[PDB]
Amino acid sequence: RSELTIVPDFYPTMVRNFNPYLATNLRTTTDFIYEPLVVFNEMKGNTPVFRLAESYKMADDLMSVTFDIRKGVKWSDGEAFTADDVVYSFGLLKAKPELDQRGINKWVTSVEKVDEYKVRFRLSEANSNVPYEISLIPIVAEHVWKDVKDPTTFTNENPVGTGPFTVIDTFTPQLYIQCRNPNYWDAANLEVDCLRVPQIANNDQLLGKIVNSELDWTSSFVPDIDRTYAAANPNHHYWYPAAGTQAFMVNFKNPDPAKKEALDNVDFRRAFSMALDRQTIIDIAFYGSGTVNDFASGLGYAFEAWSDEATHKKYKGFNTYDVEGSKKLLAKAGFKDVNGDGFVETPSGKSFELLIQSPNGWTDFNNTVQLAVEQLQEVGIKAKARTPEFAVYNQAMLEGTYDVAYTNYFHGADPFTYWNSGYNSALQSGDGMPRFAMHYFTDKKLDGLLDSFYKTADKNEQLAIAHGIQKIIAENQVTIPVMSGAWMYQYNTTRFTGWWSEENPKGRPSVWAGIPERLLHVLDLKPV
Numbered sequence: 355r356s357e358l359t360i361v362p363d364f365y366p367t368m369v370r371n372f373n374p375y376l377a378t379n380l381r382t383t384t385d386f387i388y389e390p391l392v393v394f395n396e397m398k399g400n401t402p403v404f405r406l407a408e409s410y411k412m413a414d415d416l417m418s419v420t421f422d423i424r425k426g427v428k429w430s431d432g433e434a435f436t437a438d439d440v441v442y443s444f445g446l447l448k449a450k451p452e453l454d455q456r457g458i459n460k461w462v463t464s465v466e467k468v469d470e471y472k473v474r475f476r477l478s479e480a481n482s483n484v485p486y487e488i489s490l491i492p493i494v495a496e497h498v499w500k501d502v503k504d505p506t507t508f509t510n511e512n513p514v515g516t517g518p519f520t521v522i523d524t525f526t527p528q529l530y531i532q533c534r535n536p537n538y539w540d541a542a543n544l545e546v547d548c549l550r551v552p553q554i555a556n557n558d559q560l561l562g563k564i565v566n567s568e569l570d571w572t573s574s575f576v577p578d579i580d581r582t583y584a585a586a587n588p589n590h591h592y593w594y595p596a597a598g599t600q601a602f603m604v605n606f607k608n609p610d611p612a613k614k615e616a617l618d619n620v621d622f623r624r625a626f627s628m629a630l631d632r633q634t635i636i637d638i639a640f641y642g643s644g645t646v647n648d649f650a651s652g653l654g655y656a657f658e659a660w661s662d663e664a665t666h667k668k669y670k671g672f673n674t675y676d677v678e679g680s681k682k683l684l685a686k687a688g689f690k691d692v693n694g695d696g697f698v699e700t701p702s703g704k705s706f707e708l709l710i711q712s713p714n715g716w717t718d719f720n721n722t723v724q725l726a727v728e729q730l731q732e733v734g735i736k737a738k739a740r741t742p743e744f745a746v747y748n749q750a751m752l753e754g755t756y757d758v759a760y761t762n763y764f765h766g767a768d769p770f771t772y773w774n775s776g777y778n779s780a781l782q783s784g785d786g787m788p789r790f791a792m793h794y795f796t797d798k799k800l801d802g803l804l805d806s807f808y809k810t811a812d813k814n815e816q817l818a819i820a821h822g823i824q825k826i827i828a829e830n831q832v833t834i835p836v837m838s839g840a841w842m843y844q845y846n847t848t849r850f851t852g853w854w855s856e857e858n859p860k861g862r863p864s865v866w867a868g869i870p871e872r873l874l875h876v877l878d879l880k881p882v
Contacts, residue, residue, distance in 0.1 A: 356881035357531065358850060359550040360571040362865045362872075366555050367527045373510040374492035375453040381867040382532055382549055386876075387515035388492040391421055391440070392485070393870040396767040397595070397861045399659040400486065403874060405540075406435065406493070406516060412811045416480040419488070423471040427539035429495050430513075430520035435539075437473040441465050442496035444475075446505060453505055458491050482811040486767060490870065518544045518876065528553045543877050546850070570849060573842040573864040578641075589848040593855045593863055596645040596656035596838035598765030599772055602626075602710070602726065603833050607754050607794040612704035617757070620831055621687035624672040627834045628680035629733040630726060636837055639721040645838040648673040650828035652776070652835035657769045662821035669828045673835065680733040691734055698734035708737040711759035713744040722836070723760050751789040762839065763790060773823050774804050777832065793833055800826040852878040 362381035371379045374388050385393075391407035394400050402410075407421040427435045444465040447454040461484050463476045477484055495514045502508050513520055520535040533548040534541075552569075554560050560574045567587050576583050576592070584590050604623060608614040616622045636644040647654045650669035653661055671679070684690075688701025699705050710726060712719040723739045730737045737758070742750070750756040764771050775781065779801050781791040803822045810816055843863040845853040854863040854875055861871040 355547050356545070356849070357548045357550040358546045358571060358876070358879060359552060359569050360865050361552070361554055361560065361569060361574065362867055364554050364556055364560070366553075368525065368530050368551075368553050370511050370522075370525055370530075371509040372513040373505075373508055374494065375447070375455065375505065377455065380530075380551075382519070382551060383510075383513070384492050384867050385517065385870055385873045386519040386532060386549060387513050387517045388494060389515070389517040389873065390489050390491075390870055391423075391493070392489045393873055394486055394489055394767060395861045395871055395874070397656065397659075397859070397871075400768045402485070402489070405873070410485050412482060412485065416482055416809070416811060417477050418474055419477070419485055420468060420472060420474040421488075423473065424539070425471055427516060428537040429497075430515055430535040430537050431495065431498070432537060433495065433497055433514075435495075435516050436470050437467045438470075439493055439496045440473045441467050442500065443493045444491070446494075446499065447491070450505060454491075456487065456490055458487060461487055481808045482816070483770075483808045518873070519549050523548060540877070545881060546876055546879050564844065567846060567848060569844075570846045571865045572844045573866050574844070575842060576844060579844075583844065587846075587848070589846050590844075591847060591853070591855065592844040594643055594645075594840035594843065595856075595859065595863070596647075596654055597841050598656075598763055598839045599647055599652050599654045599835055600644075600722075600760070600762045600837050600839065601647070601652060601833045601835040603751070603759050603761055603789075603793045605751075605754060605756055605758070605792075605794060608757060609755065610706070610757075612700050612706040613708065613757055615700040615702060615704065616689070616706055616708070619687060621683055622689060623831045623834065625680045625684040625687070625689070625733065626730065626735060627673050627831065628671075628676040628683065629729050629735065630834070630836065631675045631729055632836055633675070635722050635725055639718050639725060640837075640840075643840040645840070647835040647837050649824075649835060650831050651824040652772065652827065652833060653769055653824060654772075654835070654838045656765070656838055660769050660817065660820045660824075662824055665821065665825045665828050669831065672831060677732060684734060689734070696734065697736040706736065708735065709740050709757045710737050711740050711742060711747050711750065711756050713747045714741040715744075719760050719762075726760070748789050751792040752787060754792065754794060759789075760836075761789065765839070769820060769823075770804075770807050773827070774807070777823075777827060778804050795830065795832045797826055797830070847882075849882050850879045851882060852880045854878070 372383045374383050392402045394402050408424045410421040412419040463478045466474050468474050498514050519532040521533040523533040524531040530551050531548050565586050604617045606618050608617050632646045648670050650673050689698040692699045710723045712723040727737045775790040779796045803819050841864050854860045862869050
């Protein structure tokens with residue numbers, strides 16, 4: 355019996371709840387207990403990997419999509435998994451929207467049974483991203499939940515699932531073990547017998563147990579990881595691939611004529627960007643946990659699959675640490691120190707200072723701004739750090755009164771989330787809008803491409819649209835991308851091999867609930 359010790363989440367004690375539709379439950383329910391129809395491998399162009407369903411096909415009118423259920427799969431119950439399950443699950447969520455945590459009801463008007471192994475989702479809007487959203491919705495057993503009178507309080511203590519681990523072998527306040535689904539449709543590929551889940555309340559307890567080498571799969575913050583964890587045992591490894599993008603946003607419509615002259619000048623934005631030492635910002639402010647983002651478009655290395663490598667290389671130098679190139683471009687653009695103070699004045703000769711915003715209390719971001727100032731000062735740019743409370747820091751962006759601001763962004767399964775929220779002009783106005791697109795740069799074509807990204811299910815066409823967005827953003831150096839956050843993930847080779855890593859980058863390695871790829875990951879694990 356091979357047991358794999360995982361820590362998808364911390365708890366003060368173990369409470370037996372495997373209801374996939376409750377916000378508060380056990381983090382080993384989705385993906386291990388209830389297998390999705392498809393798990394999309396986001397790190398790899400968001401390519402779908404077929405599980406419970408064999409295939410899906412959107413109509414050319416993109417208002418509906420059908421999935422073909424794989425024949426022969428069973429519930430740990432012994433019962434057959436069919437379209438009836440899919441239809442029932444979505445109906446349950448449609449009828450009781452509070453069970454719909456992802457808000458799928460927004461997209462799916464109804465789910466109909468085409469036949470025992472084929473289901474059709476009807477949509478309320480043309481959107482080729484719906485199959486992806488559908489993949490994230492857990493499917494339960496109709497023959498079981500139909501008799502569940504209260505799905506909103508049901509704790510599902512003796513789960514009947516389609517996933518690899520459905521048997522609750524041990525359950526106590528300090529530990530639970532979830533073992534192999536005896537009817538698992540893909541048992542041949544499952545070599546781990548059980549999931550050993552130890553109760554760990556916080557980072558302190560995890561650190562102590564992880565350095566002792568008693569864990570296999572974790573996704574927790576580990577302080578001074580090279581010293582504490584890595585050097586304690588040669589089987590101690592970790593891999594932190596790229597995540598969400600972080601950057602300095604410049605205000606194109608700065609109300610101060612002098613500042614605008616600088617910010618609303620592509621060459622100045624490029625100079626500003628060449629002065630930054632990205633790797634140092636990651637090593638100092640973020641303790642080495644992050645990835646350099648030298649994409650002018652901010653695409654980042656989490657989506658290198660979508661990148662037009664030519665557009666990347668063409669502007670990559672404007673987003674690389676280059677002190678002398680910076681001083682030179684500024685010189686060429688007219689930004690000269692006429693005053694004699696050591697700081698560059700606008701080309702029309704006006705003096706200026708740039709206030710760089712970061713929310714009060716966000717230490718890593720505050721330190722980043724402080725480093726940016728020191729670095730900007732080396733190229734003649736006068737900048738000063740400021741740390742207003744988030745509300746003010748946010749209002750200043752929505753009102754367009756700020757100069758420069760460091761910020762992170764949401765991170766999607768593909769570049770869309772970043773590019774749309776961060777650059778779509780329609781988001782720069784209206785009541786209740788976030789700060790993400792508030793740089794006030796506008797371009798009718800760019801918007802056109804963003805609004806068409808999901809208006810085609812033709813991958814290569816979509817891919818072309820991606821390249822089109824990338825070129826517009828990069829050539830205008832709209833913002834100054836700095837880094838990509840890190841996906842937390844540590845693995846131990848003492849008991850298993852096959853782990854994903856920098857050397858074997860099959861996908862997002864985290865063990866967290868919310869990372870569907872974890873199912874494919876556990877399947878690559880082989881005991882020692």
